Amino acid sequence: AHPPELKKFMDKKLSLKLNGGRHVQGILRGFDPFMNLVIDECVEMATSGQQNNIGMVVIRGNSIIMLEALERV
Amino acid sequence: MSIGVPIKVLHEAEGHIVTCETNTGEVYRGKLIEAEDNMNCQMSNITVTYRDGRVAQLEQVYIRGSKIRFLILPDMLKNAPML
Amino acid sequence: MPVIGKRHEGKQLYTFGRIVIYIDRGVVFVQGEKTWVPTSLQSLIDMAK
Amino acid sequence: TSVIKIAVEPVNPSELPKMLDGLRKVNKSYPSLTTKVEESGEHVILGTGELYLDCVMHDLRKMYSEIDIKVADPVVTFCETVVETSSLKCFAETPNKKNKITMIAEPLEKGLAEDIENEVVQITWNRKKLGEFFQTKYDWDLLAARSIWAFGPDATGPNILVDDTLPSEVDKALLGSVKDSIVQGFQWGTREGPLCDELIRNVKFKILDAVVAQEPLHRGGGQIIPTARRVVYSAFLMATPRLMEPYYFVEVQAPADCVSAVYTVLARRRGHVTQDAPIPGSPLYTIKAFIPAIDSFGFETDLRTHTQGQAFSLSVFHHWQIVPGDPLDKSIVIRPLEPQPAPHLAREFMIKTRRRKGLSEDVSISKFFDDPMLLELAK
Amino acid sequence: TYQRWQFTLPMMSTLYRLANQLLTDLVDDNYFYLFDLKAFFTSKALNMAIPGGPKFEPLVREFNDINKIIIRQPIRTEYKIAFPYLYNNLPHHVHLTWYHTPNVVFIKTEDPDLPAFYFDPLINPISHRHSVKSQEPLPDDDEEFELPEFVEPFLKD
Amino acid sequence: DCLIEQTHPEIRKRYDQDLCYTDILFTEQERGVGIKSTPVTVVLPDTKG
RNA sequence: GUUUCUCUUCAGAUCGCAUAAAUCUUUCGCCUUUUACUAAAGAUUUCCGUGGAGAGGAACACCAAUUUUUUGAGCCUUGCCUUGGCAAGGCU
């Protein structure tokens, strides 16, 4: 079927690497057929390593180019 | 439906060791686990080469389909009953 | 004493002191280096001291 | 367990080395097969059942040897057991007279012998864990249950050696030096058994005295080990010995009208029926029964012929059960060609096995008992 | 030349019951257990007869200690047909007999009025009805699964 | 047999008679009872291919 | 193209879901003798039929909305590289 087999990764702690050289790290709970993610406890990794905290975020599917686990399935 | 010969060879590739290069220029080298019909791969136990030289090891990774621009499938597959 | 769990030609092996023997309806065969040697009872005793 | 026993001899004695070559080749082919030569010089083949042995005998003749071989009638292995407590405390003194061992034999309380073959308890376990098992399940005294020394004739054998001697009466340190020798003889004695050179089963042995020489030469080997074997035999013979026959479990499919015929065939062969039920969503009926393995020979061919081929039966090995009769009853006369009355069976089976083994027809009690104990038996 | 014939099933279904007086109603070959061609050959290669079988002129024209033999039951001649390498010596030219076939269980419908598939009374009623009712992983009701418009049971027409 | 027939195109069952492929012994085929554990190694596809 | 008839060749096959006789060598049996026999084995042939192939005759005849194909394009600055370009980096 069309959904990504992302079911494994849920509630484990992800890093993402986003289009345009951006990085965010997250505990995950969402996916839909386009891979639109809903990330929780989401940190923004700025260029300089000055880190922000931000709340729950949606991501557009096409913006992702990798999706990595910081703590295992 | 006519999902042709290449994606079947991708499913055939699973459980081996494949190399996989993304738009940005990062080169991954990892053991495959599953691959979907739009080429979303999961990959395990990777040694990644960065664009500028550096190596790193990784636990597990999932690589969006449209973001790839080759895989290096393991040569023994040339015999496979898809071909 | 019997050599527990080991047999030769289906016959039960016994130890006689330090000697490995089997009995074939009274004939004493001593385990030599590569062959079983039929042995008199007296010579069995005098090899087992 | 490969319970069914047939014996072979070659038609020409000069050809006997060729037969041995054949026997080694089948032994590789069939995993559960056991080939043994007993003290009588009989070549013996053990097998799980009728059709199993039939294929073994085909392969021996046609595939490997290509010689003429005589085949003896099928027989079953028997086991030796006790049903009652030893009437007399049996003691044996070693040949140097410097050591005295006393034992008694009793049955394993209806069940424990099964559990050990199922590996539910193991002598590799610590004595506390061993003690807890025996106390909780079987209500052993913990003092007894800690005092367990071996299983026999092997590490999962259905017989247990218990040291019931008090430390105030026997020096446990001195006893401990000779402990290992006792175990060895105990396993040995259970392996042979005194009635017909078949295994001892379901017997619990307690030691109730040990006099041990202070000098290492006189204890701890050549004196103790046969004497230990002898005292085990004396204790067993006084504890009302009995033979155990193997029973098969049988399952039969048949149409309803054939069911009554199945009962008839079983009744000839000392069979007992334990279930008979319709299998749901079919016309056939299952029947289930126990039958004695020695009586089982030909049963399948009987059942199918009487029921016009409609019934069919498979058979598998299951519990040992005590043979009717007394094996030591000298009064019984066995008349060679007749199918003997049931009370005689224990007498019959013991004699004929010994004959087949080449043993003396009757057990000289004097052989194993010391002269004071024979005087005690006389008194 | 009248070599080959090809008939429809209503023809065959009639011809069978015209012939019915001659035929025998054995559904399966289990009946002939030691009564087939192979069993007789064993009874001819040995010199020893099956009770109801035919008879022939024979093809040809310590260990034996009776006191060691437990004559529990007589070695009835059928047994030497069934296992000719065990209960017998010198099995020259003997044939292995076909051991068994599974009991064909066919239920003859007596009258054509009844539906062809029906729980005929000869068949034992299935006692089973889930009493200790198990809660195996059946998905929850209305959990987002619906079929497309036109799927149906394959041969429903 | 049905695996082998799927896997080996030249091999087909006879219409009248079962193709007992693993029953390699005449003895075994005469009885109609399997008597030896016979191994078979084949590669055969999943639903995924 | 379907039937037919004839010829040639190979038959491994329940060549046949059926079942005959003959010869020879032996073991037998009634038996003056011999056919004609008996009934088992083996080697053999004969006969009633058959299949496959080939030759020839005859008779009737569709979607541009993230996952590929209707585009995040395109533009600069640094180092090296003889130049060319490469490694990038930064932009809108």
Swiss-Prot record, chain B:
Domain spans labelled Sm: 5-77
Cellular compartments annotated: Cytoplasm, Cytosol; Nucleus
UniProt PTM comment: Methylated on arginine residues by PRMT5 and PRMT7; probable asymmetric dimethylation which is required for assembly and biogenesis of snRNPs.
Modification sites for N-acetylserine: S2
Keywords: Acetylation, Cytoplasm, Methylation, mRNA processing, mRNA splicing, Nucleus, Repeat, Ribonucleoprotein, RNA-binding, Spliceosome
UniProt key word Acetylation: yes
Domain of life (superkingdom): Eukaryota
GO molecular function, a single term: telomerase RNA binding
Function: Plays a role in pre-mRNA splicing as a core component of the spliceosomal U1, U2, U4 and U5 small nuclear ribonucleoproteins (snRNPs), the building blocks of the spliceosome. Component of both the pre-catalytic spliceosome B complex and activated spliceosome C complexes. As a component of the minor spliceosome, involved in the splicing of U12-type introns in pre-mRNAs. As part of the U7 snRNP it is involved in histone pre-mRNA 3'-end processing.
Record-stated family: Belongs to the snRNP core protein family.
Other facts: In the autoimmune disease systemic lupus erythematosus, antinuclear antibodies are developed with Sm specificity.
The protein's name in its UniProt record: Small nuclear ribonucleoprotein Sm D3
Source species: Homo sapiens (Human)
Gene expressing this chain: SNRPD3
Swiss-Prot record, chain C:
Subcellular location: Cytoplasm; Nucleus
Family: Belongs to the TFP11/STIP family.
Described function: Involved in pre-mRNA splicing, specifically in spliceosome disassembly during late-stage splicing events. Intron turnover seems to proceed through reactions in two lariat-intron associated complexes termed Intron Large (IL) and Intron Small (IS). In cooperation with DHX15 seems to mediate the transition of the U2, U5 and U6 snRNP-containing IL complex to the snRNP-free IS complex leading to efficient debranching and turnover of excised introns. May play a role in the differentiation of ameloblasts and odontoblasts or in the forming of the enamel extracellular matrix.
Subunit structure, as described in the record: Identified in the spliceosome C complex. Found in the Intron Large (IL) complex, a post-mRNA release spliceosomal complex containing the excised intron, U2, U5 and U6 snRNPs, and splicing factors. Interacts with TUFT1. Interacts with DHX15; indicative for a recruitment of DHX15 to the IL complex. Interacts with GCFC2.
Protein name per the record: Tuftelin-interacting protein 11
Species annotation: Homo sapiens (Human)
Whole-protein residues included: 789 to 837 of 837
Swiss-Prot record, chain D:
Localization terms from the record: Nucleus
UniProt superkingdom: Eukaryota
TM spans (from-to): none
Functional description taken from the UniProt entry: Required for pre-mRNA splicing as component of the spliceosome, including pre-catalytic, catalytic and post-catalytic spliceosomal complexes. Component of the U5 snRNP and the U4/U6-U5 tri-snRNP complex, a building block of the spliceosome. As a component of the minor spliceosome, involved in the splicing of U12-type introns in pre-mRNAs.
Family: Belongs to the TRAFAC class translation factor GTPase superfamily. Classic translation factor GTPase family. EF-G/EF-2 subfamily.
Disease the record associates with this protein: Mandibulofacial dysostosis with microcephaly: A rare syndrome characterized by progressive microcephaly, midface and malar hypoplasia, micrognathia, microtia, dysplastic ears, preauricular skin tags, significant developmental delay, and speech delay. Many patients have major sequelae, including choanal atresia that results in respiratory difficulties, conductive hearing loss, and cleft palate.
Name of the protein: 116 kDa U5 small nuclear ribonucleoprotein component
Source species: Homo sapiens (Human)
Curated annotation (Swiss-Prot), chain E:
Described purpose of this protein according to its UniProt entry: Plays a role in pre-mRNA splicing as core component of precatalytic, catalytic and postcatalytic spliceosomal complexes, both of the predominant U2-type spliceosome and the minor U12-type spliceosome. Functions as a scaffold that mediates the ordered assembly of spliceosomal proteins and snRNAs. Required for the assembly of the U4/U6-U5 tri-snRNP complex, a building block of the spliceosome. Functions as a scaffold that positions spliceosomal U2, U5 and U6 snRNAs at splice sites on pre-mRNA substrates, so that splicing can occur. Interacts with both the 5' and the 3' splice site.
Protein name: Pre-mRNA-processing-splicing factor 8
Secretion signal span: none
Domain comment in the entry: The MPN (JAB/Mov34) domain mediates interaction with TSSC4 and SNRNP200. Has structural similarity with deubiquitinating enzymes, but lacks the residues that would bind the catalytic metal ion. Contains a region with structural similarity to reverse transcriptase, presenting the classical thumb, fingers and palm architecture, but lacks enzyme activity, since the essential metal-binding residues are not conserved.
Localization annotation: Nucleus; Nucleus speckle
Tissues where the protein occurs: Widely expressed.
